[PDB]
């Protein structure tokens, strides 16, 4: 099977200490994220919420966002 999780990536250029895994950042950058040249698809969800007398505060958690993505939201009351 495949695997899932978070990772840390260290890249070096003519820096032989990187293969030890302990290279501290130095010098001027040379590589960048490739995805920042492009864009993907859209996901939309709609939910109905009610604020009772004792439940006037509500919070919701969102999934992780990759770098360069965008987030939008809007709320419209049912009535008055």
């Amino acid at each position: 099977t495949y695997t899932t999780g978070s990772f840390q990536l260290i890249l070096g250029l003519n820096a032989p200490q990187v293969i030890s895994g302990e290279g501290e950042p130095e010098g001027e950058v040379f590589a960048s994220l490739a995805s920042l040249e492009i864009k993907p698809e859209a996901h939309v969800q709609e939910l109905e919420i009610r604020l009772d007398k004792d439940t006037r505060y509500l919070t919701q958690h969102t999934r992780n966002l990759q770098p360069g993505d965008t987030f939008h939201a809007l709320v419209e009351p049912i009535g008055e």
């Binding site: 969800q45 958690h61 999934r63």
Partner: peptide, 8 residues
């Protein structure tokens, strides 16, 4: 999926 869901 957009928001947090429930565990089955």
């Amino acid at each position: 999926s957009v928001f947090l869901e429930s565990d089955l």
